C-alpha cells in the first residue's frame, strides 16, 4: 500500500509524474478538486493548496502548482496562469510586445504529511514564442521556448520536455526527500 498520494485533477500532469515516479510502489494517486487562493506568488498559492487538499483526502498528500511569470507583464500571470490560458488561448502570444518576450516557467511541489508543509520549487528561464507551434503536451506548451533551445515544450517528446521543464528536476528532489 502507498504512503504518499499525489493529488491532481489534471490527467495530463498525471501521465507526466507517472512517467518518472511511476515505478515507485510507495506513491498513490488521488483526484480531489481544490480551490486556489487569489495571489500571484507561487509560494503562497502552493502552500495554501496543500492545506486545502489534506483537508479533503486526510492522507499524506503531494500537490502541484505552477507559474508563468512574464517580464512584459511585470510577472503576470504568476500563479494566475490557469485562467489566462482559458481566456487568452493563443492571443497570449499577441498581447506581449515583440522584442521583450522573456519569461520564467516556475513550478512547485508541496507535500503535507498532516503536520508540516514543505515546498520544492524549480524554475526554467525562457521566452514566449511569436506564435503557437507544436502538438504534444498540454496547456501553454505550444507558446514557451526554453533558453538555448529553439523548440517549444509542445514540439518535444515527454523525455525531452522533462529535460527542460521544472518537473524534471523536481522528480529527484521529491524522490530523495520522501524515499520513494
Amino acid at each position: 500500500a502507498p504512503t504518499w498520494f499525489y493529488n491532481t485533477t489534471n490527467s495530463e500532469k498525471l501521465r507526466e509524474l507517472q512517467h518518472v515516479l511511476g515505478g515507485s510502489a510507495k506513491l498513490g494517486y488521488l483526484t480531489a478538486k481544490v480551490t486556489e487562493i487569489l495571489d500571484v506568488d507561487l509560494e503562497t498559492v502552493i502552500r495554501a493548496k496543500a492545506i486545502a487538499a489534506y483537508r479533503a483526502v486526510r492522507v499524506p498528500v503531494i500537490v502541484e502548482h505552477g507559474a508563468l511569470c512574464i517580464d512584459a507583464l511585470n510577472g503576470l500571470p504568476g500563479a494566475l496562469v490557469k485562467p489566462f490560458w482559458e481566456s487568452l488561448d493563443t492571443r497570449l502570444c499577441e498581447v506581449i510586445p515583440a522584442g521583450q518576450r522573456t519569461a520564467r516557467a516556475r513550478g512547485a511541489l508541496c507535500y503535507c504529511d498532516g503536520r508540516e508543509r514543505h515546498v520544492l520549487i524549480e524554475e526554467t528561464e525562457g521566452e514566449i514564442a511569436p506564435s503557437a507551434r507544436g502538438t504534444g503536451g498540454f496547456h501553454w506548451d505550444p507558446i514557451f521556448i526554453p533558453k538555448g533551445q529553439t523548440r517549444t515544450f509542445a514540439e518535444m517528446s515527454l523525455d525531452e520536455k522533462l529535460s527542460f521543464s521544472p518537473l524534471g528536476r523536481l522528480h529527484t528532489r521529491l524522490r530523495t526527500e520522501l524515499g520513494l
Binding site: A1, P2, G28, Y29, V57, R58, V59, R115
Partner: protein, 277 residues
C-alpha cells in the same frame, strides 16, 4: 504505530474463533449503498429550513444543527424519519446490497452480536440475504421479546427507523444517552467487559461512544493490573483516513488502528472481512 491488513489478520482470527470478536458498524459501512453520511443529512436539513448548506454548517456541530431542525416547527422530526425511511430503506438500496462485497463478506461469518449506529435495515438485511436470520434489538420491548435460540443479535445502538422513538439524532437525545441507562447502553458496557470490538466504517465523533471507552479504563486503571496484563485485550479500528491526533488518543483506551488502502474503500474492507474467515 499502526497495524496493516496482513498484520491484523491473525489477531482477528484468534478472537473470532474464540467467539470474542464483535463488529461495530458506522455510517461509512452504508456508503456504497448511495446513502447520506452525517454531512449529506445536514445538507438536506438546510434545504428544508431555507439555509444554504455551507452557511448552515458553520453555526454548530452535527448534534446541534439537528436539534435546531427538530424545534423549528411541530412534527418536524417525525417527517425526517419518514423521509429517511423512504430513502435509506428503498428498493434500489436493497438491490445494491446483495451485490455489495462488504455486506456479503460480513454475512459469510457466523457472528453472534453486531452493533450498528446507522438507521437502516442493511446490516440485518445482509444476514437475511445469506440465508441466515437476525434479531434486531433496539428498544426495551425488543430485549424482552421472544427470539430464537442461536441467532445473531443486531443491536441498533442509535435506533431504528421502524421505531422512531429510539432514534438519537438531536443534541437532547445525545444528552439523554449520557446517563448510560438505555438498553443499548447497558448491553454495550457488558459486552465491552469481555470482548474485542472491530470498528468498521465508523469514526469516533460521538461523545457518548467515547465516554463509554473512557469509563472502561477507569475500571481498568483502578484494578491495578500490570503493564503486561492491562494491555492484553485490544479493540480494533479499521479506517482509511485516520489523522495524526486520533490514533494516539485511542491507544489510551486499548484501541488499535488498522490502516486500510484508501484508493478503493469498499474492496479494502471486504478483504479485511474475508481474512477473518
Amino acid at each position: 504505530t499502526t497495524l496493516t491488513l496482513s498484520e491484523a489478520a491473525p489477531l482477528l482470527k484468534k478472537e473470532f474463533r474464540e467467539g470474542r470478536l464483535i463488529p461495530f458498524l458506522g455510517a461509512g459501512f452504508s456508503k456504497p449503498l448511495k446513502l447520506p453520511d452525517g454531512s449529506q443529512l445536514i445538507a438536506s436539513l438546510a434545504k428544508t429550513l431555507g439555509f444554504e448548506p455551507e452557511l448552515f454548517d458553520m453555526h454548530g456541530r452535527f448534534e446541534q444543527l439537528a436539534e435546531f431542525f427538530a424545534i423549528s416547527a411541530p412534527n418536524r422530526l417525525q417527517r425526517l424519519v419518514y423521509e429517511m425511511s423512504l430513502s435509506f430503506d428503498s428498493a434500489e438500496a436493497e438491490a445494491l446490497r446483495e451485490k455489495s462485497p462488504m455486506h456479503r463478506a460480513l454475512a459469510a461469518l457466523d457472528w453472534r452480536t453486531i452493533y450498528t449506529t446507522n438507521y437502516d435495515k442493511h446490516v440485518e438485511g445482509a444476514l437475511r440475504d445469506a440465508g441466515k436470520q437476525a434479531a434486531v434489538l433496539a428498544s426495551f420491548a425488543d430485549f424482552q421479546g421472544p427470539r430464537a435460540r442461536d441467532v445473531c443479535e443486531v443491536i441498533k445502538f442509535h435506533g431504528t427507523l421502524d421505531q422512531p422513538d429510539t432514534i438519537v439524532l438531536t443534541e437532547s437525545s445525545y444528552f439523554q444517552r449520557m446517563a448510560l441507562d438505555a438498553p443499548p447502553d447497558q448491553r454495550l458496557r457488558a459486552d465491552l467487559l469481555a470482548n474485542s470490538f472491530l470498528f468498521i466504517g465508523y469514526s469516533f465523533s460521538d461523545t457518548n461512544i467515547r465516554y463509554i471507552w473512557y469509563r472502561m479504563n477507569q475500571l481498568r486503571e483502578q484494578s491495578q493490573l500490570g503493564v503486561k496484563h492491562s494491555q492484553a485485550r485490544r479493540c480494533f479500528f479499521a479506517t482509511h483516513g485516520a489523522g495524526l491526533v486520533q490514533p494516539d488518543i485511542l491507544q489510551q483506551w486499548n484501541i488499535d488502528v488498522i490502516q486500510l488502502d484508501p484508493t478503493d474503500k469498499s474492496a479494502s474492507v471486504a478483504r479485511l472481512l474475508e481474512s477473518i474467515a
